[PDB]
Amino acid sequence: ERKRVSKLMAYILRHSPEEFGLRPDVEGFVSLNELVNALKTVYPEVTEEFVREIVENDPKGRYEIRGDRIRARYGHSFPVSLDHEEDTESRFLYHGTPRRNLPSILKEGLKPMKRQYVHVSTDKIEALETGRRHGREVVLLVIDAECLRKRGFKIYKAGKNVRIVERVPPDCITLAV
Secondary structure (H helix, E strand, O other), rough: HHHHHHHHHHHHHHHHHHHOOOOOOOOOOOHHHHHHHHHHHHOOOEEEEEHHHHHEEEEEEEEEEHHHHHHHHOOOOOOOOOOOOOOOOOOEEEEEEHHHHHHHHHHOOEEEOOOOOOEEEHHHHHHHHHHHHHHOEEEEEEEEEHHHHHHOOEEOOOOOEEEOOOOHHHEEEEEEE
16 A cells, blocks of 8 residues: 555656646645645545655655645756755765666767666666566666766765766766666
8 A cells, every 4th residue: 555655656746646636736745635635536544644654664765844834855857956965975885787788878978768766876776676676687877976976966965875977978978887
């Protein structure tokens, strides 16, 4: 049950709020009341406290609540002004992706594709888990963070391990494993 409701929250808060009549503010926030009513049109047993539990217990830091407002921290496919802190300490960042994507990435770099930002991780396991969601022969990409910073692509702390960046030029991918 928790996972079904969390997935629908991610759909609403990252991709299609307007399908439920919700309009996020410039920071990606909608009211908690609004989200709850939206979720109840699919899962009528949902309550504000159950959503608060989802948020507190999320293992990746998917969600954030500011008072009576909630957003997804990352993953959006529509414009958001996020106020996350910069990751200045990480030396290496990781991105897992099916091997079938590697020729294109070696030419183009990582691109945000359908989302606003490229997502990477400080954590090798989480990067690989993400890649494996997409397909079978996952490669772990090792990314030189300081390369990114040098080229004006600042990295931001979007979740526990999740990091967001505008793009990752192929020169900043040091290894594919």
